[PDB]
Symmetry: D3
Subunit: 80 residues, 6 copies
């Protein structure tokens, strides 16, 4: 039903919390969820996102300068 609405649903299904410090937004997932969530982020292609790294329950998303991790995390919290 499109990379549009799936975004939301993936976000609502998975995002436990959003935090930030500096040029990084930190996304918390349930255990094992990090790689899954970061895959869609990479795949919708946000160009204020330089890249992402997933661990097990955490994703670091790197804001493209001048954008900041707070601005980045906000841009997300509205997609939910």
């Amino acid at each position: 039903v499109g990379t549009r609405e799936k975004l939301r649903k993936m976000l609502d299904d998975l995002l436990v919390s959003v935090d930030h410090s500096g040029n990084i937004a930190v996304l918390r997932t349930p255990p094992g969820g990090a790689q899954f969530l970061a895959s869609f982020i990479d795949r919708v292609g946000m160009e204020e996102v330089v890249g992402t790294i997933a661990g097990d329950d955490t994703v670091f998303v790197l804001a493209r300068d001048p954008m900041t991790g707070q601005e980045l995390g906000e841009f997300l919290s509205q997609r939910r």
Copy 2:
């Protein structure tokens, strides 16, 4: 727990099931393997000796004498 989380996750995440020997193989979308296997470990099924998740694949070890096919059969059935 499997009440509303069993079938739902499988539909959300289980792309295909295959098997060989005492192992059932679950394919997920990219990055999905750890996440689905998290749900499987958490119900704590006796016949699941254990799970290993890669990136898009999960290997489920069936407890002998149960077969990998029989095991993959069930998770397929929760759908």
Copy 3:
């Protein structure tokens, strides 16, 4: 695809092959396991029920009645 990417990657990445039962075991250099298994999944070999990659090891599940030794034999042969 296996034209120029089959033998080449194995030479680049396959350190050793071993086996037991319906499983062939591929050792790679550190961090190499996901990368090599990516190539294997992508040819989509029928007899490969699936793959799991750790850090330097890949487990390849052979589809019964084929054996893990027979399977490891082929990838060794692409070299």
Copy 4:
């Protein structure tokens, strides 16, 4: 090496042992699977065809004719 590092790590990391077929299954605490399997690979046991570590689970492939139970038996015994 297994002198002071064999039993010690297992006590530090091995939560439980199970098995099925030619595979022994080791459960670790969260995130512990790669770390414990690192120690196992490094002794280089002949009968260990190879190891794959997920997040909290390790699959140890026993070299035929040895069984996964017999293999899990030993690591249990180093405790």
Copy 5:
């Protein structure tokens, strides 16, 4: 024997080195150790830590602003 002393012992058992640059402290582990170490960090709940990402032998720990990676790494080197 508590999330108190286990901290230390986990730290002593695992921390190969601590480094830093910017808002990140970098922790080096033996191979395969990264996820294990970062699990306890997440679990003791440090609130100057926004989050952590583990690889194989490295953990990136994100300092909460205003705190810095150096201050963060020091706060650790005293727990050992």
Copy 6:
């Protein structure tokens, strides 16, 4: 044939793109390639690199201050 030339060949074989923001250079790989590439980086020992974290197709490399992610990513793009 040495940690010298293998660098290049590994880099040419694997580096899809290089990006940067702040004190981090972001390296993109094919799927599953991230851990492999970051292993060699760690192993050639660059001391303007504090550390690396690999995911599945992305590596974050932390520049040692004063060095920046751009300067870091450039130092690489010449090794190819």
